Scaffold this active site. Structure first.
Site, PDB file in Angstrom:
ATOM      1  N   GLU A  39       0.860  -1.179   0.000  1.00 11.07           N
ATOM      2  CA  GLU A  39       0.000   0.000   0.000  1.00 11.07           C
ATOM      3  C   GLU A  39       0.890   1.220   0.000  1.00 11.07           C
ATOM      4  OE1 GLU A  39      -2.392   2.750   1.588  1.00 11.07           O
ATOM      5  OE2 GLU A  39      -2.839   2.187  -0.471  1.00 11.07           O
ATOM      6  N   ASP A  68      -8.830   2.987  -0.787  1.00  8.26           N
ATOM      7  CA  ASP A  68      -7.511   3.526  -0.472  1.00  8.26           C
ATOM      8  C   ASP A  68      -7.200   4.835  -1.162  1.00  8.26           C
ATOM      9  OD1 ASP A  68      -6.790   1.630   1.374  1.00  8.26           O
ATOM     10  OD2 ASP A  68      -6.276   0.215  -0.242  1.00  8.26           O
ATOM     11  N   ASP A  84      -8.040   0.627  -5.226  1.00 11.33           N
ATOM     12  CA  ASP A  84      -7.909  -0.113  -3.977  1.00 11.33           C
ATOM     13  C   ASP A  84      -6.772  -1.082  -4.144  1.00 11.33           C
ATOM     14  OD1 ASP A  84      -9.608   0.202  -1.729  1.00 11.33           O
ATOM     15  OD2 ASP A  84     -10.333  -1.874  -1.966  1.00 11.33           O
ATOM     16  N   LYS A  86      -4.913  -4.504  -3.112  1.00 12.73           N
ATOM     17  CA  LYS A  86      -5.292  -5.778  -2.490  1.00 12.73           C
ATOM     18  C   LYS A  86      -4.032  -6.602  -2.485  1.00 12.73           C
ATOM     19  CE  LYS A  86      -9.595  -5.399  -1.899  1.00 12.73           C
ATOM     20  NZ  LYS A  86      -8.865  -5.063  -0.669  1.00 12.73           N
TER      21      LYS A  86
END
Lengths: 238, 241
Positions: A39, A68, A84, A86
């Site tokens: 991330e 996110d 996002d 993952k």
DNA sequence: AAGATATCTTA
DNA sequence: AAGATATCTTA
């Protein structure tokens, strides 16, 4: 496009955490460490490309809120993109992988619940999927290293393959988590997500299936447990 | 001792070093995010080296889990005393104002404290101690820009007042749930110093374990049974009924 | 108290 | 499929 740029940058592109004093602590092998690692790794890439395309990038001002990253150009603020990150592992390459893609009981049934901007202001929902092969942690992963010892710090991952794709394309009919009710992706190989070999026909079929998904397997037994059993439901009258 | 050493080490090491980002083998540094998950991983990879410094000093073996979801984060012991291990677990929480009350989620109550070998590195009954190393940090205002090796100081951090403590799980556990669908044990909701001073509610680890082994998952199935410490104690008094 | 964010294991 | 790992939020 913004997309061709992003996926092109992600592709072209960690041993641990560093402190202000100079110490660098190695990484752990549990998925909770890697998710954070990926991330963070993605944060300054998504922001550099967004700029380039005159996009503004926002993040959850509140915790427990999807996604996110929220993207949008000033002018047309009603047309927001959702990104996002993952993450999942693999023991040996070629193996099938699966992702958990979000709760089916929140911003997909309630427009405000657990999401930054009302579900309706997002035109796209991408999934930047990271995959990595597991590697047992090291004894040396327990001592701190120094700025110049860097090329010696082992990591808990081998070969990381990353892909980017629209959410519904890679979504499936099997639940990703039981108690925290999550939508599950297709259980296929890496390039199936990369070639977008999904099972749902349209964005709206994807939402119709998940929005109609029952929590209690009993209620689901006589409702529909999968894509096959779903379309039948359709042809019967619901 | 091992304990006072660990504590004193977690203080001095955490009081002088600040983690401000992740680093690549080639040089690039990526800043951190302001959300708990991000933060809770930091304090986890951060403590590992210390717990390993001190454990070694007392001749203790350290072991992290083998599977991706097994408790505790570390298993200490002496080969001279196998069926006597110490369990260490790092927990995190946050506060807006400095002087608030806090609360941690102390793990599940239907897994290993109820079943011997479920979700734990070695059988539950092989542990003597069960410590918690709490990290309370303070949320700050919130960057998305890669800083170079020679730019560590400009990197802003999204936490402003780390406070750690080491205490016994049972001493600080409370009579309420920490989570619902994830069935977690809740700690006491109290000011920091209370976690350090061990100002809990359970009289013994013996009372802690039994409260949590009979806690019914839902208020409905609970009311006829017991919903707190006073009700638990009356239930016991009434003859476990 | 009850459910959400993320992701995994057990079988 | 279900229930674990962690932690938060809402009421």
């Amino acid at each position: 496009s913004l997309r061709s740029d992003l996926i092109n940058a992600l592709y072209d592109e960690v041993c641990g955490i560093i402190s202000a004093e100079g110490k660098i602590y190695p990484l752990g092998s549990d998925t909770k460490v890697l998710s954070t690692i990926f991330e963070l790794f993605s944060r300054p890439i998504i922001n550099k490309i967004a700029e380039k395309h005159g996009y503004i990038v926002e993040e959850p001002k509140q915790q427990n809120h999807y996604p996110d990253f929220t993207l949008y150009k000033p002018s047309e603020p009603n047309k927001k993109i959702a990104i996002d990150i993952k993450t999942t592992y693999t023991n040996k390459e070629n193996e099938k992988i699966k992702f958990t893609l979000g709760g089916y009981t929140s911003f997909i049934r309630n427009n405000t619940k657990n999401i930054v901007y009302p579900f309706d202001q997002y035109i796209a929902h991408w999934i930047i999927g990271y995959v990595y092969t597991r590697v047992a942690t090291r004894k040396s992963s327990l001592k701190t290293y120094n700025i110049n010892e860097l090329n010696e710090i082992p990591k808990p991952y081998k070969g990381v393959k990353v892909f980017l794709q629209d959410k519904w394309v890679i979504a499936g009919d099997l639940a990703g988590s039981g108690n925290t009710t999550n939508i599950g992706s297709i259980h296929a190989h890496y390039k199936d997500f990369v070639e977008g070999k999904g099972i749902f026909d349209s964005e709206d079929e994807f939402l119709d299936y998940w929005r109609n998904y029952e929590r209690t397997s009993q209620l689901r037994n006589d409702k529909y447990n999968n894509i096959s059993e779903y379309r039948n439901w359709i042809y019967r009258g619901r």
